Amino acid sequence: QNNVLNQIHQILLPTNGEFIPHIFYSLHQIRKDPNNLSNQLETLTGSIRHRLKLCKSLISENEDTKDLLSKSPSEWQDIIHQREQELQIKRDVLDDLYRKLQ
Amino acid sequence: SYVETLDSMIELFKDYKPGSITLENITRLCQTLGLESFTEELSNELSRLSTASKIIVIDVDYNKKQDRIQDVKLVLASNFDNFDYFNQRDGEHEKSNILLNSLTKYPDLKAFHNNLKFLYLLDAYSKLDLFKYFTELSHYIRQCFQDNCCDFKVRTNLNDKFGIYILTQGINGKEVPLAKIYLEENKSDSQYRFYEYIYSQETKSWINESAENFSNGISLVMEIV
Amino acid sequence: LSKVQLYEDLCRYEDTLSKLVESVDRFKPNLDIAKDLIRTDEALFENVKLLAEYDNIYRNLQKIDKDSEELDSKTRKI
Amino acid sequence: SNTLFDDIFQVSEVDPGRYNKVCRIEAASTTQDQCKLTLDINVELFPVAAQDSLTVTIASSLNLEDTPATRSWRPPQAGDRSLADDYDYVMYGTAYKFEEVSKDLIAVYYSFGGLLMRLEGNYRNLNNLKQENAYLLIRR
């Protein structure tokens, strides 16, 4: 199990409010009071925004995810299908020798 | 001005995706449009959420273990408590309510938000009892289409949403949703006193019946599916 | 960063949310920016689903990587 | 270009001070009981008495078209259209302080070449003012 993808996956979707329930809860608490300095939505949504910077830091620091997320799924399937063929040709260049010793 | 603009923004923000399956999203989604709600805890593991202002008393049996509701219990305090809230379509006679399907199948609350808005529209403009009017409008339009001697099958509560769906039998033999009719509020003007429409069986005409029962700023309009 | 499309996905997600909260804090909301935010959010969710597919096929890639290198090791020692 | 802030102020009192050409006026808005104004006026060019109704407008630029000073000032030509044409007294200056007087009132300080002006108000009509250069347009 690859690590950095896992703490990404439970750092943007913890096991709840994903990104938008927090922001509409914030603009819902604005509805009680629109006339105060401490009613900036940026203050409490910065926690979600700090989570966004955490996501940026975790995807930038790791380089295997940098190639993991850069290729299309059909590309991944065709490159694993052309990576099984050299292990297959190694299997047959050992089994023909196995035949030749018999 | 300022209040209507922020109301439009909160309306769109709920209209995209109003949170995931949890109790506090349901609580704030029910509170934000003017319905005060009270939460009754059955135990530490199971809870009930109830909304009631004057007539409509909706209750959901949400569980904290399965992340899934159990049953939906809604009781009307009006003069007509036989409101149709189940799905009615051809193929089977299973009678399951829309709110349970919206809360269980879809992981997002958009269908539930639309259903809650429709039930608020039914409740707030109820002495035109919109429950019995919406129930009997399907039968009235079905009898009207029977007089037209053409194949337009009328079914109610399709696509996990309230509404009177009008469908026709196509080539494939399966009923295709082309357009559904329902009661929609007109924000451009609210002074048209909506009548309880009765379709005559003999002279094949619509004759107004409303004389004292009244609804405020509502109309029966068509939208293309 | 320029090759992974999810990177620019959360980049203009951050852009749309930042100018949206700036617009509503300046008491002048807009609709087109909200529609753009919806368009970015949906694509973010299919990006999450395809990240799950990427996750499973990366487990597959690591499996074939380790079996290929151990058979190469056996081949050269033989 | 467009109006950053427009309001009608009622001049409570005019203080000459120890000056012959410049008077400091105290004004409050007529619509709001909360947006008040302190301002220095060259009264030889624009005489202001007490209980005068002044339409005070703050704009980022004087041209009628929207914004696309760092440009050298030039004398106005004949046929030149500007926002100054609709007002009797136009002053240009720098914002130099943004003070939060209370939990809801913010204060903006402008300096029109040493002629200071202190603008109060809530933050839902003074939010267009920022730390930049603004034209102060006054008509009677």
Curated annotation (Swiss-Prot), chain D:
Name of the molecule in the record:
DNA-directed RNA polymerases I, II, and III subunit RPABC3
Superkingdom, natural source: Eukaryota
Fill in the subunit field for this protein.
Component of the RNA polymerase I (Pol I), RNA polymerase II (Pol II) and RNA polymerase III (Pol III) complexes. Component of the RNA polymerase I (Pol I) complex consisting of 14 subunits: RPA135, RPA190, RPC40, RPA14, RPB5, RPO26, RPA43, RPB8, RPA12, RPB10, RPC19, RPC10, RPA49 and RPA34. The complex is composed of a horseshoe-shaped core containing ten subunits (RPA135, RPA190, RPB5, RPO26, RPB8, RPB10, RPC10, RPA12, RPC19 and RPC40) where RPA135 and RPA190 form the DNA-binding cleft.
Location(s) in or outside the cell: Nucleus
The UniProt family comment states: Belongs to the eukaryotic RPB8 RNA polymerase subunit family.
Q: Where is this region: Non-specific ssDNA binding?
A: 15-38
State any GO BP term from the record.
Answer: transcription initiation at RNA polymerase III promoter
* Phosphothreonine, modified sites: T67
Positions carrying N-acetylserine: S1
Mostly located where? nucleus
Short name of one Pfam family for this protein? RNA_pol_Rpb8
Q: Per its UniProt record, what InterPro entries does this chain match?
A: NA-bd_OB-fold, RPABC3
Any one GO CC term of this protein is: nucleus
Q: What does this protein do?
A: DNA-dependent RNA polymerases catalyze the transcription. of DNA into RNA using the four ribonucleoside triphosphates as substrates. Common component of RNA polymerases I, II and III which synthesize ribosomal RNA precursors, mRNA precursors and many functional non-coding RNAs, and small RNAs, such as 5S rRNA and tRNAs, respectively.
Is Nucleus found in the keyword set?
yes
Additional information: Present with 6210 molecules/cell in log phase SD medium.
Query: What keywords sit in the KW lines?
Result: Acetylation, DNA-binding, DNA-directed RNA polymerase, Nucleus, Phosphoprotein, Ribosome biogenesis, Transcription
Give any GO molecular function from the UniProt entry.
Answer: DNA binding
SMART domains named among the record's database cross-references: RPOL8c
